[PDB]
Amino acid sequence: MTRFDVLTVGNAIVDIISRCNDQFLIDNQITKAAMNLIDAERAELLYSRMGPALEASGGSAGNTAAGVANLGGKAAYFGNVAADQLGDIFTHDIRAQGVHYQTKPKGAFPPTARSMIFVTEDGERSMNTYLGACVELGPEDVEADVVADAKVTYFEGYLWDPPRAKEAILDCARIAHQHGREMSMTLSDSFCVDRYRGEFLDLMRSGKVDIVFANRQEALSLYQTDDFEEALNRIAADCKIAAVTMSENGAVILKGRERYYVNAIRIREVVDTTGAGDLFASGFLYGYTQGRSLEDCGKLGCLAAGIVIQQIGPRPMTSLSEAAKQAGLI
Amino acid sequence: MTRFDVLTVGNAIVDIISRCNDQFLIDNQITKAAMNLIDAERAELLYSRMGPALEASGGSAGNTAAGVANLGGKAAYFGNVAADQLGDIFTHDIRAQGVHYQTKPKGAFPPTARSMIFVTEDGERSMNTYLGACVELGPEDVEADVVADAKVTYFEGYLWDPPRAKEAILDCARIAHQHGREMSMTLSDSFCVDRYRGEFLDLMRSGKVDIVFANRQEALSLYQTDDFEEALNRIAADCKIAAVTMSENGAVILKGRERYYVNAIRIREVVDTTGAGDLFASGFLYGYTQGRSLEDCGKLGCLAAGIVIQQIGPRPMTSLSEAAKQAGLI
Ligand SMILES: Nc1ncnc2c1ncn2[C@@H]1O[C@H](CO)[C@@H](O)[C@H]1O
Ligand SMILES: Nc1ncnc2c1ncn2[C@@H]1O[C@H](CO)[C@@H](O)[C@H]1O
Ligand SMILES: CN1CCOc2cc(C(=O)O)ccc21
Ligand SMILES: CN1CCOc2cc(C(=O)O)ccc21
Numbered sequence: 096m097t098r099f100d101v102l103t104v105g106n107a108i109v110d111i112i113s114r115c116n117d118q119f120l121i122d123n124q125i126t127k128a129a130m131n132l133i134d135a136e137r138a139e140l141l142y143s144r145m146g147p148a149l150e151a152s153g154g155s156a157g158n159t160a161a162g163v164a165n166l167g168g169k170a171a172y173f174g175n176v177a178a179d180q181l182g183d184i185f186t187h188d189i190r191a192q193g194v195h196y197q198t199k200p201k202g203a204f205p206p207t208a209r210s211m212i213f214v215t216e217d218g219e220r221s222m223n224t225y226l227g228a229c230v231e232l233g234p235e236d237v238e239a240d241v242v243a244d245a246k247v248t249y250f251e252g253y254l255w256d257p258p259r260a261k262e263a264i265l266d267c268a269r270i271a272h273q274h275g276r277e278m279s280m281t282l283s284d285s286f287c288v289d290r291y292r293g294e295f296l297d298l299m300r301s302g303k304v305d306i307v308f309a310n311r312q313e314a315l316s317l318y319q320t321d322d323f324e325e326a327l328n329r330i331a332a333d334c335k336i337a338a339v340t341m342s343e344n345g346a347v348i349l350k351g352r353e354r355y356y357v358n359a360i361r362i363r364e365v366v367d368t369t370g371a372g373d374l375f376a377s378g379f380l381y382g383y384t385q386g387r388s389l390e391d392c393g394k395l396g397c398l399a400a401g402i403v404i405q406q407i408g409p410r411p412m413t414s415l416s417e418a419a420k421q422a423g424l425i
Numbered sequence: 426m427t428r429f430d431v432l433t434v435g436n437a438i439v440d441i442i443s444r445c446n447d448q449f450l451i452d453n454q455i456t457k458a459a460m461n462l463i464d465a466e467r468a469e470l471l472y473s474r475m476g477p478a479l480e481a482s483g484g485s486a487g488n489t490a491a492g493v494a495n496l497g498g499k500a501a502y503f504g505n506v507a508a509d510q511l512g513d514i515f516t517h518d519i520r521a522q523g524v525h526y527q528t529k530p531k532g533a534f535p536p537t538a539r540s541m542i543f544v545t546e547d548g549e550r551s552m553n554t555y556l557g558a559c560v561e562l563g564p565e566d567v568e569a570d571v572v573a574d575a576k577v578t579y580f581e582g583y584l585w586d587p588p589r590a591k592e593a594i595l596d597c598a599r600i601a602h603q604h605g606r607e608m609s610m611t612l613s614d615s616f617c618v619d620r621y622r623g624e625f626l627d628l629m630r631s632g633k634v635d636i637v638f639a640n641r642q643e644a645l646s647l648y649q650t651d652d653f654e655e656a657l658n659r660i661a662a663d664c665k666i667a668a669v670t671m672s673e674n675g676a677v678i679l680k681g682r683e684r685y686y687v688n689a690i691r692i693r694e695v696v697d698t699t700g701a702g703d704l705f706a707s708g709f710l711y712g713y714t715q716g717r718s719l720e721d722c723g724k725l726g727c728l729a730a731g732i733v734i735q736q737i738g739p740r741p742m743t744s745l746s747e748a749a750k751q752a753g754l755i
């Protein structure tokens with residue numbers, strides 16, 4: 096036995112969520128469906144134009160850890176907030192879900208990261224992220240005992256944006272692999288992939304990453320191709336296990352020459368896609384750490400992702416474990 | 426040609442919202458369906474026990490102002506926040522709805538008020554409010570020109586808990602009445618009524634308040650009776666216009682010997698009752714300041730209340746003006 100099923104590492108962020116029309120995105124030069132990095136000045140400008148909003152703890156990896164705990168697995172999280180109200184909210188929400196979270200704030204400034212997320216009528220989400228305190232995450236925040244005692248350590252491609260987070264991840268990869276654990280990453284966002292293409296490919300080919308999560312767009316961006324079949328063949332060659340999502344088209348899990356196709360669950364209405372990929376990872380990694388088949392892992396991922404897209408906010412407000420039990424996935 | 430239809434005055438609060446079971450309330454000695462005042466230590470304690478949460482700008486009168494603006498009316502708000510992130514959230518949300526909000530924070534401590542709101546399976550809401558910076562609201566926060574130029578100034582019975590807010594209200598009553606405007610209050614909460622019964626009756630009988638809002642429980646509390654018919658007779662005698670809500674049983678508007686009953690809208694499913702009374706007042710006061718019949722004011726109130734209880738959070742995220750137009754209430 097160990098202490099954690101899944102440790103995740105990411106940018107600790109509080110989400111500020113509002114609905115908008117398509118024209119708002121155009122007028123403000125926000126790239127639709129993407130993660131748009133912004134500075135403090137731009138954060139003030141955008142907020143000044145944003146409608147009344149709702150706040151909810153976010154962070155891709157944070158959502159994933161919360162999701163694993165929700166399903167009934169044991170999760171931990173590394174991510175850096177500030178000693179401010181947003182940081183206190185973030186700390187509370189993740190710990191209240193039963194996720195181990197012990198990353199200590201270093202002061203009040205820069206303030207806790209936030210992302211202004213604009214949800215259009217089609218349920219698509221466009222994020223505008225000021226990293227704030229996230230730029231302070233470094234090797235000093237690695238709890239070596241946690242990495243050593245976690246079955247999987249999972250991290251965001253998004254961590255390549257802040258300056259020193261990657262040093263923490265390399266330390267994690269070493270510790271995890273010396274203790275016979277597995278490393279996982281998500282490609283995060285197609286533009287993120289574009290910024291760090293060579294570095295991501297090296298993480299996979301050097302074996303620092305064992306399990307890779309991607310959506311169609313990210314897989315296409317990784318190999319700079321319009322040919323999805325090429326992207327699948329290439330990704331299977333570069334990592335031990337790849338889990339590739341295709342929105343309403345479900346997912347495909349790849350391992351060597353094996354391919355496992357899973358359907359998306361039936362949806363009432365696409366309310367807000369925020370957190371879909373994160374929760375697919377929750378479902379998958381929970382399944383994986385419970386010794387379930389790759390196909391069943393995919394099924395648990397699709398169930399979790401389908402639930403989260405039918406609510407506002409990135410972390411399911413309902414029991415995923417109960418949903419799994421009812422769906423016959425247990 | 427005046428500047429505002431409705432000025433509201435209340436405790437400026439950010440809500441921290443979570444689901445719980447009935448037993449959570451019993452175990453923590455939280456009075457179900459009530460506003461429970463709490464100190465800083467208890468706020469820390471309750472939060473430590475609360476599950477993952479959502480944040481949304483609240484404050485009864487704040488919600489009411491936002492509602493009036495959403496309907497298409499001209500609103501203003503007085504309420505005191507701190508110079509902190511919660512205060513920034515509050516300031517943004519109310520101003521973004523198009524409500525005039527210019528109350529200046531006085532510093533960072535006490536911090537901005539928050540209410541931990543626990544929603545049970547039945548959709549009932551139990552609030553646990555730390556007043557924080559609200560204790561600093563006083564006469565110095567009265568924008569005299571705003572009161573003078575508002576058709577109605579509406580305020581919370583809740584304002585009787587902090588120490589100096591009542592002085593600001595008396596000042597408002599003088600300015601409003603000297604400029605031929607009307608004053609309105611909500612009785613807020615049945616326990617609040619119990620704390621300030623004599624004072625509230627005085628506000629009505631002295632004519633400092635022209636229009637009173639109440640639910641069944643508050644009206645019963647005000648006259649310390651189990652007889653609702655007696656409560657209706659007495660309240661009609663004590664104020665010029667009374668608007669009494671009865672949840673699923675609709676509302677009754679009283680003026681002298683006149684009574685106007687209004688049906689409640691048929692709900693799909695009650696999600697969260699937070700804000701129902703606040704938005705009834707939005708609808709009523711929007712109608713009233715547009716010169717609409719008392720019945721039509723009640724209709725607009727019930728419409729707004731019906732919408733807000735079908736969502737999480739106290740301020741409708743959908744267009745009330747569009748809903749009113751579709752309803753022929755225009
Ligand atoms: N740069 C970023 N790094 C990590 N997570 C992010 C970033 N920008 C937005 N997010 C998170 O992505 C989540 C949705 O996948 C949101 O909850 C949001 O907080
Ligand atoms: N003491 C209080 N004064 C004014 N409003 C309050 C108080 N406690 C809770 N509320 C607000 O009541 C609203 C619901 O009517 C919530 O949005 C919450 O913020
Ligand atoms: C998704 N998007 C983000 C940033 O730039 C991109 C480049 C390519 C490509 O080079 O083929 C492909 C996709 C892509
Ligand atoms: C409002 N509610 C809660 C607090 O105290 C109350 C007292 C009475 C009463 O005195 O009859 C009636 C109701 C009541």
Ligand SMILES: O=C(NCO)c1ccccc1
Binds near residue numbers: 180
């Ligand atoms: O610390 C807070 N407020 C002022 O000290 C706080 C903490 C968590 C959530 C909201 C506010």
Ligand SMILES: O=C(NCO)c1ccccc1
Binds near residue numbers: 206510513
């Ligand atoms: O002030 C803010 N952040 C830096 O502390 C702020 C303002 C509004 C909403 C969230 C954070």
Ligand SMILES: [K+]
Binds near residue numbers: 368370405406409410
């Ligand atoms: K969502």
Ligand SMILES: [K+]
Binds near residue numbers: 699735736
């Ligand atoms: K509500």
